[PDB]
Structures are given as C-alpha cells and as structure tokens.
Amino acid sequence: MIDYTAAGFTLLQGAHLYAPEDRGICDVLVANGKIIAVASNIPSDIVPNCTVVDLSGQILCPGFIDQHVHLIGGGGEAGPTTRTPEVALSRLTEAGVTSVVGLLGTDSISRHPESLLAKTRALNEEGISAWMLTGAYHVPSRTITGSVEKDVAIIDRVIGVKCAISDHRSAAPDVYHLANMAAESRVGGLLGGKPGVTVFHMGDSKKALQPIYDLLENCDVPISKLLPTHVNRNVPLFEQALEFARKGGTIDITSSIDEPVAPAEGIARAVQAGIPLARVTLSSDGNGVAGFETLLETVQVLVKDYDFSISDALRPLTSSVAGFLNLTGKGEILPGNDADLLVMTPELRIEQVYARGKLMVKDGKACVKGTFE
Ligand SMILES: [Zn+2]
Ligand SMILES: [Zn+2]
C-alpha cells in the first residue's frame, strides 16, 4: 500500500453548503489544507487514503474572520489589574473563528506591536490564520520599524494600522497626523501586497466620524481603506456610519456591544438603509473580558430573530471581511481557497471546525489547543 497521507485528503459529503452562497447539498474535497473541489456527489474514492466525513443533515459554511481581537490581551483602563489575558486558540476555534486580525487598544505602554506580532505568528503555527494592525489608539503610531508605512510594507503579518478618534482615550490627533498615518498604511500596503487599511476605534464624541471626513478632505487615501469600528456604540454615530457606508465606505459593527444598537440590529439597519452586505463587517473586540460567543450568536439572531437567510447572515463574518482586507483564499468555499470550514446543525450550532484542512473542533469542543492551554 502506497502512502498518500501527506495530502491529508478529506471529503466532506452530504452537507447543505453555504459558501456563503447557498449551494444546496454539495460535497467539498480537501487536500493540503486547500479546497480542491466543490461539487455534488464527489466519489468517495476519487482520491486515495481519503478521510470521508458524513455531513448529511448538517450545514457547511466558511470559517469566521474576526478582524478586531486583542490577541495578546488588552484592557488596563482601570489600572494594571484590568489588563486582560492573551487569547487562547481554543476560544477562537470553538467560536468558529479560523482567521483573525489582532490589534492593540488604549494601552500601548505595557502592550507592544512586537508582542502582537509574535502571538499572531504563534496562532499561525498552531493552525489558524492571523494578521495584525500596527499602531494602537495613540497617534502618531507606535510602530515596529519606526514608520507606519514601513511596518505595513515589510512586516509580513501587518496589513494596516489602527488608531482612535472621537474618544476620551484618544491622543487628540489632528487631521495631518491622521491623514499621514492613513496614507502611510495605504502606500505601505501597495508595497507589501497588504490591503493597507486604517481602522478607527470610534468613541462617543459628538464629532463622531468628522475626523475621517476631514482626513478625506486632506489626502487621497481611498474611502475603501478607512474602517470605522464600534459604530453601534451610540445612535448618532451609527447613523453617520450608515451614511459613510452609503458613500462607498465599509463599516465594522462590534458584536460585543448590545446597546444602544445590538450587532444583529445594526446589520439589519444597514440592509434596511440599502447598504450592500459587502460593506458591512462584524468583529468581536475579543479579549478587550469580551469573548467570541457573540459572533455566532449574531448570525443565529439574524436568521432566527430577524429574517436574514443563512447566506446573508454569514457575509459580515466571512466574504465581507475577506473582501475588505483582501484576504486571498478566505471567506468563501471555492476550489483553490483555504479549507477553513465550519460544520453546524440546522440550528447553526457549531459541531466541527476545520482550519486549513485540519480538524480543530470535533463535538463543539476544541481537540486542538494552544501549547499552554
Ligand atoms: Zn476599540
Ligand atoms: Zn479593540
């Protein structure tokens, strides 16, 4: 018997596929952590030494992409005792997260991008896919190489920069500092093949998104690179966000915020306003201690409580995020893409999770954990 185990051939058959597009009952063939075929009735012996998984009666969809996670820990706003712990691999996977973007927050004194970089790489070695944003709330940005542009251009896992505006914990950045930072991420992105985005932590100031419009008035960074997040934290800000998304921008709703605008509610309002789901993303702000359970809960609520189809409910956590961050090979089940898959019950309860072809979760419980979990 010839050994073909190195390919890790895995056949997921009989599941109702949402890639996120409804593909009905369809099989998915995996090899080397990559989807190599997506079709109805793929021969269970099409490839040798193939692990065939019977998913009849279950749902199969893309793994979630969480672009706002404090991977090395966050907090600290009420003293050092409030500094949260680093994220545990199993917490992400059990929540359906197979791709993640780490970032820093208010604290960039006891938190550093080099630590974030290291954690991002550990997660990649451990089985999932991780990227990070350089900078933090503070502006000018505290970077790895001394320049936002250089960080995005030369640090492989860096795809953009983060900052905070209209928030009582901002560094009071003026338009120039804000514009230059955004422009550097944009150019750095072109040079390093990164999306080169600027993520804006929004606060409760009455000025809301004004800094972003001021920025657009003082530079030429495409609006498609400017991502306001936590837009559901207050109503006036949310209304501005809808207006921003209407002008061509993409907005990030936080699932860890249940009031005044719940996450499912924000996604629904966006659609009501006529915003394409492609410009609406959902992140957890996990470990900021915030968990990741609010991600799946939002999808469940969207389908159960609101009237979103499973396909649409999935977009803000998959194709929309992958599209915004140009995450090649993610957020969609198609041949050539990474085998990041979720197996759910018809009620959308996670049963299995595959990351790059490897089984990370088996019965809703992680069977692969961080080195020191
Ligand atoms: Zn934030
Ligand atoms: Zn955050």
Q: Return all residues near 139 (Cβ < 8 A) that are at least 6 apart.
A: 163, 164, 170, 171, 173, 177, 178, 181
Peptide bond into 260 cis (omega under 30): yes
Examine the domain organization and report whether 214 and 332 are in the same domain: no
Examine the domain organization and report whether 234 and 266 are in the same domain: yes
Examine the domain organization and report whether 367 and 222 are in the same domain: no
Q: DSSP letter at 286?
A: B
Beta bridge pairs of residue 53: 12
**Distance from the alpha carbon of residue 285 to the mean position of ligand 1, in angstroms:** 7
Examine the domain organization and report whether 317 and 298 are in the same domain: yes
Range(s) of the domain holding residue 276: 64-327
129-135 and 226-229 beta bridge pairing: unpaired
- Please report which ligand is nearest the Cα atom of 101: 2
Tokens of residue 330, six digits: 């993610």
Examine the domain organization and report whether 223 and 285 are in the same domain: yes
Q: Rounded to the nearest 5 degrees, what angle is found at the Cα of 16, between the Cα atoms of 11 and 95?
A: 80
97-102 and 129-135 beta bridge pairing: parallel
> Do 171 and 209 form a contact (C-beta atoms < 8 A)?
no
Extended beta strands in the chain, E state: 10-13, 16-18, 22-25, 27-31, 34-39, 51-54, 59-62, 64-69, 97-102, 129-135, 158-165, 197-202, 226-229, 251-254, 280-283, 341-344, 350-355, 358-361
The strands making up 27-31's β-sheet, listed across from edge to edge, are: 34-39, 27-31, 10-13, 51-54
**Distance from the alpha carbon of residue 23 to the mean position of ligand 1, in angstroms:** 36
Examine the domain organization and report whether 46 and 125 are in the same domain: no
- Please report which ligand is nearest the Cα atom of 231: 1
- Please report which ligand is nearest the Cα atom of 283: 2
Binding residue ranges for Zn(2+): 68, 70, 162, 201, 230, 285
Examine the domain organization and report whether 160 and 129 are in the same domain: yes
- Find where tokens 């422009």 sit: 183
Examine the domain organization and report whether 315 and 190 are in the same domain: yes
Examine the domain organization and report whether 54 and 145 are in the same domain: no
Amino acid at 224: S
Peptide bond into 20 cis (omega under 30): yes
CATH number, domain of 208, equals 3.20.20.140
Give the determination technique. Answer: X-ray
SS (H, E, C) 230-273: CHHHCHHHHHHHHHHHHCCCCEEEECCCCCCCCHHHHHHHHHHC
Examine the domain organization and report whether 15 and 157 are in the same domain: no
**Distance from the alpha carbon of residue 256 to the mean position of ligand 1, in angstroms:** 11
The residues that are catalytic are 285
**Sign of the torsion formed by the C-alpha atoms of 290, 323, 279 and 224:** positive
DSSP 42-92: --TTSSTT-EEEE-TTSEEEEPEEEEEE-TT--B-BTBGGGBPPPPPHHHH
Binding residue ranges for substrate: 75-77, 106, 137, 169, 233
Examine the domain organization and report whether 51 and 177 are in the same domain: no
Number of H helices, E strands in the chain: 10, 18
User: How many folded domains does the chain comprise?
Assistant: 2
Tokens of residue 276, six digits: 């394409």
**Distance from the alpha carbon of residue 177 to the mean position of ligand 1, in angstroms:** 19
3-state secondary structure of 355: strand
Examine the domain organization and report whether 40 and 69 are in the same domain: no
Buried-state track 90-115, b at ≥16 Cβ within 10 A, e below 16: bbbbbbbbbbbbbbbbbbbeebbbeb
> Do 102 and 69 form a contact (C-beta atoms < 8 A)?
yes
Beta bridge pairs of residue 359: 354
CATH number, domain of 339, equals 2.30.40.10
**Distance from the alpha carbon of residue 10 to the mean position of ligand 1, in angstroms:** 39
